[PDB]
Amino acid sequence: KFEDWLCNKCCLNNFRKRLKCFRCGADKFD
Ligand SMILES: [Zn+2]
């Protein structure tokens, strides 16, 4: 994990700096 997270809806990875999943739009914290 090089400073990133995975969405809890589409399972897509995203930068730690990000705020919400750019694919489904939903936040990593729902
Ligand atoms: Zn997502």
Neighbouring CB atoms inside 10 A of 24's CB total 13
Q: What is the DSSP string of 1-30?
A: --SEEE-TTT--EEETT--B-TTT--BTT-
- The DSSP letter of residue 29 is T
Beta-bridged to residue 24, according to DSSP, are none
Say how many Å lie between the CA of residue 4 and the centre of ligand 1.
13
C-beta of residue 7 within 8 angstroms of C-beta of residue 15: no
Q: Where are the domains of the chain?
A: 1-30
Q: Are 14 and 22 in contact (CB under 8 A)?
A: yes
> How remote is the CA of residue 18 from the centroid of ligand 1, in Å?
12
Cα separation, 30 vs 20, whole angstroms = 9
Tokens of 20: 């919400």
Closest CA to 15 of 24, 29, 2, 30: 2
Task: Give the start-end residues of each E strand in the chain.
Answer: 4-6, 13-15
Tokens of 8: 């809890």
Residue type, 4: D
Q: Is 9:1 a contact under the CB 8 Å cutoff? A: no
**How far is ligand 1, taken at its centre, from the CA of residue 3, in Å?**
17
How many whole angstroms from 20 Cα to the centroid of ligand 1? 8
